[PDB]
Amino acid sequence: SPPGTLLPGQSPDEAFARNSVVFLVPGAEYNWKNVVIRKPVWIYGNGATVKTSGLGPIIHIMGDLDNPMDVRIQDLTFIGGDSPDRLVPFSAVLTNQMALWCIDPRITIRGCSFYNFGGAAIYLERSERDGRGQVMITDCRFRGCRIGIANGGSVEYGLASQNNFSDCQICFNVVGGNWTRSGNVASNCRCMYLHTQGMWYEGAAGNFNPAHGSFTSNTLNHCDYGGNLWPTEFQLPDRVINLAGFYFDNAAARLPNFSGNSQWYGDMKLINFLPDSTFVINGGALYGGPGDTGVIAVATALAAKVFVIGCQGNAGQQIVNVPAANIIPEVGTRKDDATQPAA
Amino acid sequence: GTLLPGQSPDEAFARNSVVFLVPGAEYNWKNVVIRKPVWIYGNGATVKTSGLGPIIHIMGDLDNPMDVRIQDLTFIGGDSPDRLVPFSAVLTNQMALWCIDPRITIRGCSFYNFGGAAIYLERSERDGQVMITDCRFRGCRIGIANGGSVEYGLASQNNFSDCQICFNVVGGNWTRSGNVASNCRCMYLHTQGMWYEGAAGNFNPAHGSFTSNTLNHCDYGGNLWPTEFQLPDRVINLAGFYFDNAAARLPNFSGNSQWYGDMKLINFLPDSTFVINGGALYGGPGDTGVIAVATALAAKVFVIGCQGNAGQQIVNVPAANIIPEVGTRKDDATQPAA
Amino acid sequence: SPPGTLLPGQSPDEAFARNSVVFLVPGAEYNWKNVVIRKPVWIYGNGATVKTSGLGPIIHIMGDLDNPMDVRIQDLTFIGGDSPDRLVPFSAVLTNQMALWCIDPRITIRGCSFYNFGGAAIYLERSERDGQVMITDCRFRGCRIGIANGGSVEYGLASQNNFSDCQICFNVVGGNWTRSGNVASNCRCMYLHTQGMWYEGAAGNFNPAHGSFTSNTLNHCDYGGNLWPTEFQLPDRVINLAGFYFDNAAARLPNFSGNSQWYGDMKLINFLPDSTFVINGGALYGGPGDTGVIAVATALAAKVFVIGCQGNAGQQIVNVPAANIIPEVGTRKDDATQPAA
Numbered sequence A: 001s002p003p004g005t006l007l008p009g010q011s012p013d014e015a016f017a018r019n020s021v022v023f024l025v026p027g028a029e030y031n032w033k034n035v036v037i038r039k040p041v042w043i044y045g046n047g048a049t050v051k052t053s054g055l056g057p058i059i060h061i062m063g064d065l066d067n068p069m070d071v072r073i074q075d076l077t078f079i080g081g082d083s084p085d086r087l088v089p090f091s092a093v094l095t096n097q098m099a100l101w102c103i104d105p106r107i108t109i110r111g112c113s114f115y116n117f118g119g120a121a122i123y124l125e126r127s128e129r130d131g132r133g134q135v136m137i138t139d140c141r142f143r144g145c146r147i148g149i150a151n152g153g154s155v156e157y158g159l160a161s162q163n164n165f166s167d168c169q170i171c172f173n174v175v176g177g178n179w180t181r182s183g184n185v186a187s188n189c190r191c192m193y194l195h196t197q198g199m200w201y202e203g204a205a206g207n208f209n210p211a212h213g214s215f216t217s218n219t220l221n222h223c224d225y226g227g228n229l230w231p232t233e234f235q236l237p238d239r240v241i242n243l244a245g246f247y248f249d250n251a252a253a254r255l256p257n258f259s260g261n262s263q264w265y266g267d268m269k270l271i272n273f274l275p276d277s278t279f280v281i282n283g284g285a286l287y288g289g290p291g292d293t294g295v296i297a298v299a300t301a302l303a304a305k306v307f308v309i310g311c312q313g314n315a316g317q318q319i320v321n322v323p324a325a326n327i328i329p330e331v332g333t334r335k336d337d338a339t340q341p342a343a
Numbered sequence B: 001g002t003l004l005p006g007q008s009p010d011e012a013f014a015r016n017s018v019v020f021l022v023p024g025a026e027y028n029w030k031n032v033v034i035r036k037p038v039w040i041y042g043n044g045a046t047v048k049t050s051g052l053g054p055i056i057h058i059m060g061d062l063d064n065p066m067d068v069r070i071q072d073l074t075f076i077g078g079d080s081p082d083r084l085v086p087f088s089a090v091l092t093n094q095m096a097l098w099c100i101d102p103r104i105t106i107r108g109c110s111f112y113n114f115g116g117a118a119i120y121l122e123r124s125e126r127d128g129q130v131m132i133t134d135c136r137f138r139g140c141r142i143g144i145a146n147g148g149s150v151e152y153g154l155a156s157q158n159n160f161s162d163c164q165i166c167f168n169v170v171g172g173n174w175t176r177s178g179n180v181a182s183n184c185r186c187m188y189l190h191t192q193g194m195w196y197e198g199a200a201g202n203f204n205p206a207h208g209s210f211t212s213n214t215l216n217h218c219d220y221g222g223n224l225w226p227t228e229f230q231l232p233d234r235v236i237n238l239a240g241f242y243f244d245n246a247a248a249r250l251p252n253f254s255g256n257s258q259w260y261g262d263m264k265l266i267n268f269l270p271d272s273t274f275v276i277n278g279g280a281l282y283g284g285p286g287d288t289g290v291i292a293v294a295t296a297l298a299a300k301v302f303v304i305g306c307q308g309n310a311g312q313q314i315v316n317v318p319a320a321n322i323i324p325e326v327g328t329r330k331d332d333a334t335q336p337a338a
Numbered sequence C: 001s002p003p004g005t006l007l008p009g010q011s012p013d014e015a016f017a018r019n020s021v022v023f024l025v026p027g028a029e030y031n032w033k034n035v036v037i038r039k040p041v042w043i044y045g046n047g048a049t050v051k052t053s054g055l056g057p058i059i060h061i062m063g064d065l066d067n068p069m070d071v072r073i074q075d076l077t078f079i080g081g082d083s084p085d086r087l088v089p090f091s092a093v094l095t096n097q098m099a100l101w102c103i104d105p106r107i108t109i110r111g112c113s114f115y116n117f118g119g120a121a122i123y124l125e126r127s128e129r130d131g132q133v134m135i136t137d138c139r140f141r142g143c144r145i146g147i148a149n150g151g152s153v154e155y156g157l158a159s160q161n162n163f164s165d166c167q168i169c170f171n172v173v174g175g176n177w178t179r180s181g182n183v184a185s186n187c188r189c190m191y192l193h194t195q196g197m198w199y200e201g202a203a204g205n206f207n208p209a210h211g212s213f214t215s216n217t218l219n220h221c222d223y224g225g226n227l228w229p230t231e232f233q234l235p236d237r238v239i240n241l242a243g244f245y246f247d248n249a250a251a252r253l254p255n256f257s258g259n260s261q262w263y264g265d266m267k268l269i270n271f272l273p274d275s276t277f278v279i280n281g282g283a284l285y286g287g288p289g290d291t292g293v294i295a296v297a298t299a300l301a302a303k304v305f306v307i308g309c310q311g312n313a314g315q316q317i318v319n320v321p322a323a324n325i326i327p328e329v330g331t332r333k334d335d336a337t338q339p340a341a
Ligand code: MMC
Pocket: A059, A060, A061, A062, A101, A102, A103
């Protein structure tokens, strides 16, 4: 192997430690487990596939926020197992079933695919509370994963755009604040966006300065009806929750900006958020029914702070607890029901 | 993995999972067939062709997890186009890529002077992720044609210029975001009885997402393609955005710029509303960049959070449906014409 | 040296003039100054780094708008110096401290990084008034200006880029660009357009701005992170920068939708009267004090709308009439001393 090439069966750790850039064998099958990257390196995957066994992650990446060079991973497929067991309860042990675990990340992940991870396919965390460590995840595919992307507290200002999710329970497990998530396509996932207190994958910085990012031009279809196979019921560290397409429950956090999103048979649960704010579902397409499929529900206590502006939709779409004066133009069927949203 | 000019592409694709072209070289291909996933690193090469297209036929395997991927490759379909020739079934073959049952990624490629659709995607049967990003389309009759049941694709950050129709839309649920189009007659077309519906037909159509796009100089100040356009069974008069299908819903439409970029909302499924949200609507003088809705459906259309000038005409949408006021509101039941 | 490879220490000018596509040595360190590209060429940077010295640009690119092939630069890091001197007054001298100076560009810049440029990291100009431009997935850090597009450099796309610790991200003259999905933090100004700018180029301040500005984030511009000064020297006067600064009676504002402004002040000083402007679908968070103020000139206030925006009580909206703000967001205020140029 000339310098820069990493063959199947060779030691990845040694290759990464000795090279600033590494090229994999085009279309080859690798088998990696707990590989450790301690310095910036670029990996050109060249259409290769990385399988694994046992307890993940496939790669541990120890970031150096001081170093101007980023870790970059392009054009690589990661396989976490065979098609998932969706009925297994989630637990601390399964949080290890990751493709990438990055701490203090300065990373670019572009054109990669992630199949059948029992935890988060990608997990980013910060070793200490503070965003000069820029994170970019674009043009990736996620299929069969429990969680797509988990960003811990103080992993901030990342960009996750133009990704495609299908058959995942939770696409974005959101803790760290200020991310832009734009132009992502999701279908047959229980939940595109989850934020609450007491989450998995908060990391060492904890649930700090959370969410309040940007969520634009995304599609979240068939969350609760007409495609998704993952259960609604989901085990957090201290309690069970009932997932929705968009789930937000944290009295100490603000919601992201929410504009240009399509929700066909979604459901959205705005359970709790910081009272010194408003929230607008802006420029959305809201399609649902018949029955309670693709419901948007807000806590009555906060309903007056929620608006639905410039949205299109059908009569079958239910909007729950938002005052009629707050919905311009009329869209869907407006309803009052203080039992909704349930946590 | 290297494929040289003059070698057989079919053999190279059938024998390799990944193929690298000679950087900057000129290839000459015609009716190449790909039957298994393969990645092509184009490396700035150019592919010319002759006769009847496509340049490449791609027979997809939806069962197979690997995608076909094509990067950094320029496709040339001919010399600068004959814009006055009537469109016909024969010209539908003048394609760069024809993909069936696609699981495909097309990134950083350029498509010049195709007499049909530069890219055509179809499904062999009614119900495979599709990504088309950072591509350039210039001089093509049609940019991207997605047939019925080719759904949930992403076409973003592409640039279209001097094309008659950028997106020939049949298949549903695509995201089309951040595309820049100038001097094209039509950015988006959906109707019944289209070209390139493919085997699944006009099924579960449109109702996708159309955000942050720019469609400029469609009917004035740049475009050279004719308005009049031949579908299989009738002639239509194109607009920057043309929608006529009583059995389909419109996409979400937010953050788009329309400078001299006419829109015709002729017909759509009555159990829906439509909003032109967060747009910039600039037009006039005269009837340039008109937004027109059928009077029968006008009450279901809203123009919300849009900016624009006095010269921009908005036709048949009720005044109560336009917040804030933008342009010059007008009633005219002869608009929009098919 | 096989065809298409350019090694450190070899002449870049000769390599570019002899090849249509060039591959750099993966992860190698190059040192270039005033390299000249006269014909389309693609550069695969392969994670290499380019340092420089003296007066920039690192690369001069003389475009041929007649030629269908683009210049393409991928996966390359450009270093303009050590961490910047933010208190130095800006002057004509420093405008040369660029990574890329392109004239009559047909160019794609993808996956590149730009560190510590004393001028514009990227400057695009047109040699004559009336060529597709794409700048995506790039990082800009410590630069005075990120991207400067001169007059008649139009219809470019700048999307999915990340800016931090820059004074001005986009120095906007040329019209009709789409700027979408960009993330900026700790920069004094994300968008600047006015008369009498730096980097107007040979075509001047012609057919300016009026593009598209969507899904961007501009955070901590005037508070809580940014270290660059507000006060900024243009050729003929000093201005006081804001996160979004627009002052040109002869130009229209871009479409403005889906943007987040946390401590991200906006000054709409002057713009063409035959238009309206809408802050659509935004998140507007500010306070306490005058941090993240949105201010419009009282003369033009009636033409400005704030539609479908969310925010907090601390966010100040100045001079926009109450009837123009739907739904209510922030604290509405009248003050004709704002915005100051
Ligand atoms: C971070 Hg292992």
